[PDB]
Symmetry: C6
Subunit: 125 residues, 6 copies
């Protein structure tokens, strides 16, 4: 069987930080994986030895939180969840650009354990 985790960072030595089984770990990738093309926040597949053997895409289901503000660094956002839970999360690539821009009350799909926002979910009317 394989498990999965959320990619957090790629190091100069081609190891990666991944959030998996509820904790951050530094893991190695299979030689066939091009680490230069990994996208932070994407789900990655792990073998039993915890080597990254495949890159997937971003989570498509889960918690929604409301955007309050993108932080000064342009990399993280302050979001507000259901019971008034304020949190900081990383912006995945499709959100960090900038064409469109993120505006406060935008609804964002988030993983608050890994600390990532993946997708904006549109429309009241």
């Amino acid at each position: 069987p394989s498990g999965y985790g959320v990619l957090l960072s790629v190091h100069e030595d081609k190891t990666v930080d991944v959030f998996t089984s509820g904790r951050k770990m530094r893991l190695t990738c299979s030689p066939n994986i091009d680490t230069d093309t990994l996208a932070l926040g994407q789900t990655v597949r792990l073998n039993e030895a915890l080597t990254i053997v495949e890159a997937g895409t971003y989570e498509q289901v889960g918690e929604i939180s409301t955007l309050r503000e993108v932080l000064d660094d342009g990399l993280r956002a302050l979001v507000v969840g259901h019971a008034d839970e304020e949190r900081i999360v990383w912006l995945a690539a499709p959100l960090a650009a900038v064409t469109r821009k993120l505006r406060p009350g935008d609804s964002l799909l988030v993983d608050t354990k890994a600390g990532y926002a993946f997708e904006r979910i549109p429309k009241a009317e």
Copy 2:
């Protein structure tokens, strides 16, 4: 003895993603499983080795959430729970079959697996 999980996806090599023991796993299927006939969201039965040995029905008990909108893709929906927790979930076939659905419909959901399975009269 067998365990269970919620089927999430089927891969080209006949392995499947399943949500079981609180996380997503990629698992193999027994010779009896024709993956072509699997329905996403259904419960699957797992042997000790975590091989899928039987494909079952959708969950029938659990949390209730309220439908806010089906997303543009027609695959997912925005649902709101008891303390106004908004989530995105996948729609199982029975919900996609009617997609009416409104908006306010009460849906049986598994928020860990990320699925909505059944509409519950409020009602009737």
Copy 3:
């Protein structure tokens, strides 16, 4: 030592779904057990190999929830918990025998196993 679980369903092949050690399992009964006399929601005792070796009484302590409606199938009910969490649960065999509210009855429930066991006014 023996473990325990809540009997969820009895299958046509005589195996049984049981909620035990925090998850749903499909288990086999000792030949001693007459599976046709098993009662939904009752506590079953397991040996170390997870064979069902004895069938017992129903859970008698735990969470109280309020009945909202008995579903159209007569097997499940919509209940509302203390913080307005709505859930669907199975009716244990004693409750599967009649009810009547909204249109309010207080039920002993185990939301992890997904069962209601007993009504709390003066009821047996």
Copy 4:
């Protein structure tokens, strides 16, 4: 090392049901233990093999809940906790008698995982 659990019932065959490590189990007692004198709801000590090797007393710290009503059987009570959480619990012996009697709004020390009430905690003024 030893672990602990809450005694739930004593069987005719001298085995006992105990709530330990978050679940109910049927366990045996050391031959030196007189099972006839066990008190339901008391904490019991388990060796690594999960044999009951010692009986203790009732929990003395933990959750408080307010009594609503003793059930018709005289063995269980409906209690109401902080966030309006209603639950049924077993009455330990010092509470089941009957001299004094339990009255609704009494504060009770409870273990809502094992499903027991142990002690009444007195006095506003």
Copy 5:
């Protein structure tokens, strides 16, 4: 590598009850521990074998609860948390030393271990 727990009691045979890894355990002490000098509620350091190897100070971070009353025994107190969860906890020495305390004082507590350790100005 060492773990930690909260000391709950000392036994006549020099073993101790400690709350560690989310539950109470009876553990032994190293030759260096003079159990006569232990203070109930203090943090203890445990080696891989779960032997107490060092007795430390009280916890300094964690949940805050409000004092309602010290119980008649002078050993325990009724405390109320954020969602008005009332609990009974043991008093550590520093709190017993002042027992003033009032009632309204804010106390640093570990509700799993069942201890109050320190009074926090509201204040100052």
Copy 6:
């Protein structure tokens, strides 16, 4: 693989308390690590034997809580979470350098490790 933890304290014997895999541990540093340069609250990397092999940056994502007061010791603060949960946390090294509210500042916290790391207005 390597694990990670939050550095809680540095002891006079050069060992360090670290919150890792959901609990507090006392660990040893690789000889490479200058323990006098370690900074409270920083993330440390662990080998499989749980030796600290590298010291890193601070947590940058997670829960936001509101500062109520910096305690008299200048090392800890009282913070209030989203559901009015009050807690005492340690100040990470960057925050241990000044503050100022009630008499309101938003702090990034990890309540499991018991640390605040960063203030969120425009602050570095």
